[PDB]
Amino acid sequence: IVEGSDAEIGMSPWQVMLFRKSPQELLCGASLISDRWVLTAAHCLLYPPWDKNFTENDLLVRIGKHSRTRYERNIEKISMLEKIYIHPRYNWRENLDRDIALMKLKKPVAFSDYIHPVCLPDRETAASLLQAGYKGRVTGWGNLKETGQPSVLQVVNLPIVERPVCKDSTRIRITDNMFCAGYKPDEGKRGDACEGDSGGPFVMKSPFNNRWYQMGIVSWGEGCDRDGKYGFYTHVFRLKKWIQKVIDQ
């Protein structure tokens, strides 16, 4: 998280960390959506240009963490991976199209105050909240700045930018399975996701029901917190069909 602040305990309890088994290292972020399910970004386990073909027993999942490293005794739950569902039509070559992947845990997790899932947007909430100029939270232990290593979970709130701006904000191909969010140069306010926040959720708290909704998934960008540059996230609802498909497995 670039130009953010330290997290309050359990303000993102659904925040999930992808850890690698050997060498023991962080990969990126994810999101607790179910009790046995976690949702991340596909480039975070499969990006051939970076020689990445991560298997089940290559990865851990650390839920309900706060300190980036030190093993929080009697707080964080470390889980195993049983199955990994990556989107078949994940266009990794061009523009991380359908940058999304799901994770079946060995068996379910018991919730604490530090572990608690986020809601998925329905047909209504998606249209209702995902208007440009509306604000949403992004979390992760990602870079503080592009090269940036925070000791604690980082938080930022950012407005959705409208499709036109994003379309030509970059020379990269933009789809509706993608949305851009962040700050205009003029806006004086700064903020953006950085490399390492990937798979982390773009959450929006609904005003009707005080429930939190993961609207996005930290996908990509060009640099970090740059002027005319906005963080790109995976459009959750425009994939809630495939999402539903593989949970009904």
Partner: peptide, 26 residues
């Protein structure tokens, strides 16, 4: 079923630092 309600914010009936900030945008 119980998602999106933080058992120390929504459940303890509490605001965070900047959920107010989020609300004010809508």
């Amino acid at each position: 079923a119980d998602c999106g309600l933080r058992p120390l914010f929504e459940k303890k009936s509490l605001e965070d630092k900047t959920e107010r900030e989020l609300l004010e945008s809508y």
